């Protein structure tokens, strides 16, 4: 069927440029107008730009007018979004979407969306996390159940993965979504509930991996 | 610029329920309204256009109604695939979306288990103290976490993170992280988090003494 594959997203410093591309297949690309649409936690879903099937007409949201340029290559079946003078509030997942077919007098929107490509506009430098134990004790024990975990602090950019005991422990693991701190660095915790009778004798190790910086940390979590 | 408003923002619902969500526009958009469905980590998908026409492939339990400024999307009998976030979109003058309505998995009430974690000696050696309060496996989602340092309420120095509903039991877990400098952390003694939840008859407090 119709398929749209975005690419070109990444981390870019404020004021720099970035070029997104969208590879289309499964339909006649040159016969259809296209949209760029973005999604961020702060602004929700936000239309960005549209281009006619032949590139003749283009329209832009006020927040990107003069900085973004939508274009297309109908011989290559590719849609482009040239992003200039990027600001922090342009951080979002960017989607290309195909306009639906309709009748001559209809108004139009989109029927097929791509998978999305992530754009992060930040002046933070790449940095692996510090991993700190969340040590169990009587203060993290209710009955025969105890909680322990790992704090994964001050890394950039997303993502990090966390496993426990190299994968052998998955029942009861909660890894929280990252939060962005005032420093521009992300932080998260991973926790797991264990039999309180196993503390001090059973070994618990969180395995933290952060590919952008090649960080790997195995942190042993011992009780207090 | 046409403003769009979706109500409610979250609906707790069950399989087999008849669900209706509403979307409103600040001015008349005739029937130029589309409905999109989005599942977590996934791209949006078109359900309805022209306010009431079902996109091909969309099951018949979906329907839409409305014209002018008031619009609704109805699911006649909810199925597990329909637990998702739904957005409306006017396409009468440019394109603007509503804030979205999340259909949430209703279940019975479960009060949180509360755990507190003191800062590690390794982090304190670096000049920072992070204190973590964990609320495990609770429902519904609304909860309040208050930090008290020597019995004084903290404000502006904590951040909360919440998981999605657990795939196995549909509960939430919540972390609250209190961040202080090493010097601020050592200027006090008792560190506590107090938790309220509609499932708890009394607030639950977990605390430790610095050094203890």
């Amino acid at each position: 069927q119709v398929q749209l594959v975005e690419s070109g997203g990444g981390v870019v410093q404020p004021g720099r440029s970035l070029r997104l591309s969208c590879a289309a297949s499964g339909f006649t690309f040159s016969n259809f107008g296209m949209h760029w649409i973005r999604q961020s936690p702060g602004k929700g879903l936000e239309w960005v730009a549209i281009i006619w099937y032949d590139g003749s007409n283009t329209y832009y949201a006020d927040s990107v007018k003069g900085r973004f340029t939508i274009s297309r290559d109908n011989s290559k079946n590719t849609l482009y979004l040239q992003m200039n003078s990027l600001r922090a509030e342009d951080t979002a997942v960017y989607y290309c979407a195909k306009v639906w077919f309709g009748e001559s007098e209809d108004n139009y929107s989109v029927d097929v969306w791509g998978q999305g490509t992530t754009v992060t506009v930040s002046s933070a430098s790449t940095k692996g996390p510090s991993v700190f134990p969340l040590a169990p004790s009587s203060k993290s024990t209710s009955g025969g159940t105890a909680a322990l975990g790992c704090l994964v602090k001050d890394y950039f950019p997303e993502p990090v993965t966390v496993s426990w005991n190299s994968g052998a422990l998955t029942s009861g693991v909660h890894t929280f979504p990252a939060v962005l701190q005032s420093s521009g660095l992300y932080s998260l915790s991973s926790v797991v509930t264990v039999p309180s009778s196993s503390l001090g004798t059973q070994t618990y190790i969180c395995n933290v991996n952060h590919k952008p910086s090649n960080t790997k940390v195995d942190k042993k979590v011992e009780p207090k | 610029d046409i403003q769009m408003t979706q109500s409610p923002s979250t609906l707790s619902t069950s399989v087999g329920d008849r669900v209706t969500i509403t979307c409103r526009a600040s001015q008349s958009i005739s029937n130029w309204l589309a409905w999109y469905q989005q599942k977590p980590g996934k791209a949006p998908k078109l359900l309805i256009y022209k306010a009431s026409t079902l996109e091909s492939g969309v099951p018949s339990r979906f329907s839409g109604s409305g014209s002018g400024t008031e619009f609704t999307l109805t699911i006649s009998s909810l199925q597990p695939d329909d637990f998702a976030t739904y957005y409306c979109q006017q396409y009468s003058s440019y394109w603007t979306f509503g804030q979205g309505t999340k259909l949430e998995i209703k279940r019975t009430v479960a009060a949180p288990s509360v755990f507190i974690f003191p800062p590690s000696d390794e982090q304190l050696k670096s000049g920072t103290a992070s204190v973590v309060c964990l609320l495990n496996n609770f429902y519904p989602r609304e909860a309040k976490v208050q930090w008290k340092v020597d019995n004084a309420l903290q404000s502006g120095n904590s951040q909360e993170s919440v998981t999605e509903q657990d795939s196995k039991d549909s509960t939430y877990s919540l972390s609250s992280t209190l961040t202080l400098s090493k010097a601020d952390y050592e200027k006090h003694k008792v560190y506590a988090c107090e938790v309220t939840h509609q499932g708890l008859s009394s607030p639950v407090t977990k605390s430790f003494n610095r050094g203890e």
Binding site: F32, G33, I51, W52, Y53, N57 | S93
Partner: peptide
């Protein structure tokens, strides 16, 4: 026509 009009080939 306007931005919302037919942007496809005819």
């Amino acid at each position: 026509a306007n931005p919302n009009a037919n942007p496809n080939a005819n």
